[PDB]
Amino acid sequence: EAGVTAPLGYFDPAGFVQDEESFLNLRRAEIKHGRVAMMAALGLLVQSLIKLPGFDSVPAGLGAQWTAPGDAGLWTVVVLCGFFETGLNQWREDPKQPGNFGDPMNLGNYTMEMRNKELNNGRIAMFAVMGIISAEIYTG
Amino acid sequence: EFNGADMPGATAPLGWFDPLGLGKTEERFNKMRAAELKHGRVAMMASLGCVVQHWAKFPGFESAPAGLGALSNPAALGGMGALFLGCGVLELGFWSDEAAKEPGNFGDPANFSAEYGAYSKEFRDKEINHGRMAMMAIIGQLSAEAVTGMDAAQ
Amino acid sequence: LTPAQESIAGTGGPFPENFWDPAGI
Amino acid sequence: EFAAGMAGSKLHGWGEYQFDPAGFATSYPELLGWFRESELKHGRVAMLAYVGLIVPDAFRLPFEEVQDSSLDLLSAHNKLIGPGLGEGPMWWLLLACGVIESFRFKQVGLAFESLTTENAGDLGLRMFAPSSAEGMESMKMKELKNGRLAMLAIGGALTQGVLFNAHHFPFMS
Ligand code: CLA
Ligand code: KC2
Ligand SMILES: CC1=C(C#C/C(C)=C/C=C/C(C)=C/C=C/C=C(C)/C=C/C=C(C)/C=C/[C@@]23O[C@]2(C)C[C@@H](O)CC3(C)C)C(C)(C)C[C@H](O)C1
Ligand SMILES: CCCCCCCCCCCCO[C@H]1O[C@H](CO)[C@@H](O[C@H]2O[C@H](CO)[C@@H](O)[C@H](O)[C@H]2O)[C@H](O)[C@H]1O
């Protein structure tokens, strides 16, 4: 155990891994959170630049939550994410080997180096998105 | 799935057109074909829906523009909403892809294979190609409509 | 179905004999 | 086995619905062909009844006697009977329907002696029809289902339209 995607720091202290199934669940959650956070970083970046059709009025920042078009957009995004996460989507993850959705787009390899890069970039994106959101809600 | 030229979607113009090679193993191809058939059918019906809705409407939906902005009318929104529930009933229920025996095979509810058709490769290819053409079209009709406000007629 | 899935077969879906599981959970 | 092997029990939603609570089919086997002919007649009359309940609002026949805009499902028949006997467009329709019906006597004999269970309701029209026997059976089940639905729908539409004055398509107050 503890020999999968642990660069430059080895195993994190006070790790909650426990048994193999617990570590599998934790890795699934970690990769999911990373991927979301990476997505959120990119969404904020692109929203600061361009807006959807019929979406120019709504604020580019967090304010889209309580605006009318932004509210409907967020609700439908949540519904689609539910469709994707409940398993209804054909590309669904293997119960073992979490974070592997079968590679929908044949982008390429699945090497340990690629897994480490994905996980670490998600790790950065976590802090990036959290800091951005905190800064916005705090300053204004 | 070493070869797929015998699959319904080969067609003469471009046999097994797949430069990016997204689906090359039987499982990936089955999933992609289920998605393609669903998209094609949805498009075939969206396109005809536009065409008919322009010159026809149900009682109580008279005010609806019948075009891209049809969702604006509250009655049309309630109708889209009931259609969404019915489509969910079909999807999670009768026409669920997981329960499907083959990609896009939902059991032939009405025996078109028995009458005025057959479950032949020719008809599968016909369905696939019509779905592609309807797909490309709805995008065109809807987009052209947005750029230049017009109805389906074009 | 599967040997594990049979532990509850006959108690689901519109008719009892079905096994409704579109997500394949 | 059931009825006389007639179409109308197979190809249901779940495959083999055999609807006969009151055992008319078993009690009167000699009348099964008559029952099938009557069911098909009622269904094919109800289909056209619904379509002719809808269409008149959009269109009216060319002759200058049905052009009144107040000829709803309620007043149409009584108004169109007209004066005396054998003078109205309703009478023209009755005579046309009788002429059509008389051919069934040619087909199945004068007294429906030849009316069997495998030819009940079959008037020999085979245009735009399935080539295969299975396809023909499937289309017969479609026809039976559509006819039963149209019978129930025309009954409900007429009852509702008269009860609440909604003589047009919604048929709801
Ligand atoms: C606590 C909820 C719950 C749980 C644990 C289960 C569990 C089960 N159901 Mg399911 N079921 C539920 C609720 C639930 N059901 C409800 C409410 C319905 C009515 C639609 C059904 C209808 C149903 C049928 C018809 C059948 C089953 C069957 C099964 C079994 C196999 C399928 C499966 O993997 O289900 C696992 C289910 C889940 C993990 C639930 C996932 C829910 C997702 C995340 C969506 C939730 C969103 C929801 C709409 C709430 C939104 C609220 C928000 C807007 C505020 C399994 C024991 C099958 C069976 O017993 O076969 C013998 C079967 O045939 N169920
Ligand atoms: C005692 C049990 C019982 C009751 C009390 C009952 C009541 C009602 C009511 C009123 C409340 C209505 C309005 C109604 C309507 C329909 N019933 Mg139903 N029904 C019962 C039993 C069966 C069986 C066994 C079958 C069946 C069917 C159909 C079909 C579709 C036919 C088709 O399309 O083939 C329709 C429209 C057949 C089927 O296939 O349904 C998908 C079928 O096999 N029913 N049924
Ligand atoms: C619950 C159940 C079932 C059931 C059922 C039940 C209870 C069914 C009931 C059906 C019922 C009760 C059906 C009435 C029809 C009435 C009609 C056609 C009336 C026509 C009336 C006409 C054509 C009148 C015409 C005119 O008067 C007009 C309009 C104006 C006048 O100037 C002129 C004339 C006189 C010409 C299933 C589905 C069978 C099986 C399932 O398993 C269980
Ligand atoms: C904003 C946050 C909203 C949160 C909404 C919460 C919705 C209600 C909770 C849903 C939890 C569902 O959990 C349940 O279905 C998941 C669907 O992937 C399963 O998911 C897991 O197991 C299944 C095994 O085949 C498959 O779905 C996947 O391979 C695996 O990831 C979980 O094993 C199960 O416990």
Give which of B90, B97, B98, B106 to mutate to test C binding, by max C Cβ within 10 Å: B98
Cα separation, D31 vs D122, in Å, equals 16
Ligand nearest D18 Cα, by number?
2
Tell me, rounded to whole angstroms, the distance of Cα D10 from its chain centroid.
21
Place of tokens 């619904």: D50
Q: If you measure CA to CA, which chain A residue comes closest to B97?
A: A90
Mutate-to-test residue for ligand 3 from D18, D44, D158, highest number of ligand atoms within 8 A of CB: D158
Nearest CA owner, ligand 2 atom 44: D17
Is the distance from the beta carbon of residue C6 to the nearest atom of ligand 1 less than 6 Å? Answer: no
DSSP string, chain B: ----TTSTT--SSSTT--TT-S--SHHHHHHHHHHHHHHHHHHHHHHHHHHHHHH---TT-TTS--SGGGGGSHHHHHHHHHHHHHHHHIIIIIT-TTT-SBTTB---SS-TTTSS--S-HHHHHHHHHHHHHHHHHHHHHHHHHHHS---S--
How many Cβ atoms from other residues are within 10 Å of residue B141's Cβ?
A: 22
Region of D128 on the Ramachandran plot (φ > 0 left; ψ -120 to 50 alpha; else beta): left
Place of tokens 């599998």: A24
Tell me chain C's radius of gyration from C-alpha atoms.
Answer: 8
Examine chains A and D and say if they touch (3+ CB pairs below 8 A). no
Burial D131-141 (b: 16+ CB within 10 A, else e): eeeebebbbbb
Method by which the coordinates were obtained: cryo-EM
Q: Are D6 and D32 in contact (CB under 8 A)?
A: yes
Q: Which amino acid is at A102?
A: G
Cα separation, D123 vs D107, in Å, equals 8
Burial D91-118 (b: 16+ CB within 10 A, else e): eeeeeeeeeeeeeeeeebeeeeeebebe
Q: If you measure CA to CA, which chain C residue comes closest to A88?
A: C23
Q: Using the Cα atoms of residue A106, residue A112, residue A115 and residue A121 in order, give the sign of their dihedral.
A: negative
Q: Are B27 and B103 in contact (CB under 8 A)?
A: no
Q: Are A118 and A30 in contact (CB under 8 A)?
A: no
Is the distance from the beta carbon of residue D12 to the nearest atom of ligand 2 less than 6 Å? Answer: yes
Cα A52 to ligand 3 centre (Å): 54
D69 CB within 8 Å of a chain B CB = no
Place of tokens 């932004």: A70
- State this model's resolution in angstroms: 2.8
CB-based contact B92 C22, cutoff 8 Å = yes
Task: Tell me which chain A residues have a C-beta less than 8 angstroms from the C-beta of B97.
Answer: 90
D135 CB within 8 Å of a chain B CB = yes
SS3 A5: coil
Angle subtended at Cα B87 by Cα B83 and Cα B88, rounded to the nearest 5 degrees: 120
Q: If you measure CA to CA, which chain B residue comes closest to A91?
A: B31
DSSP tag of C17: B
